[PDB]
Amino acid sequence: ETDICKLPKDEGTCRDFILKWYYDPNTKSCARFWYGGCGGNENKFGSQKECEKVCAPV
């Protein structure tokens, strides 16, 4: 959708690890990643369902 969905996965830094989801434009679907708590970007969602609503083509 918006160009935020095309941003790269960014695991960031810091050690407050939380599992997040990001949209992968190459597979047209969201996948999980571990975010460290600092230095990420906006292609980062708390659930697969939210990532898919905001980002996926259908």
Side-chain angles (χ1 to χ4, degrees), residues 1-57:
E1 147 159 340
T2 145
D3 274 68
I4 293 322
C5 300
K6 305 162 185 172
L7 291 169
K9 176 193 92 166
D10 181 5
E11 288 178 347
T13 197
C14 295
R15 308 271 174 101
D16 179 22
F17 298 101
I18 192 167
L19 265 179
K20 298 291 192 175
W21 292 84
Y22 80 101
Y23 183 71
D24 186 344
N26 300 324
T27 62
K28 310 204 131 135
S29 63
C30 294
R32 286 188 187 68
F33 76 106
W34 287 102
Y35 178 52
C38 302
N41 68 34
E42 301 153 300
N43 190 359
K44 171 162 59 61
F45 301 92
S47 64
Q48 191 177 13
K49 171 175 206 115
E50 182 68 358
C51 180
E52 293 281 319
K53 281 193 167 155
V54 172
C55 287

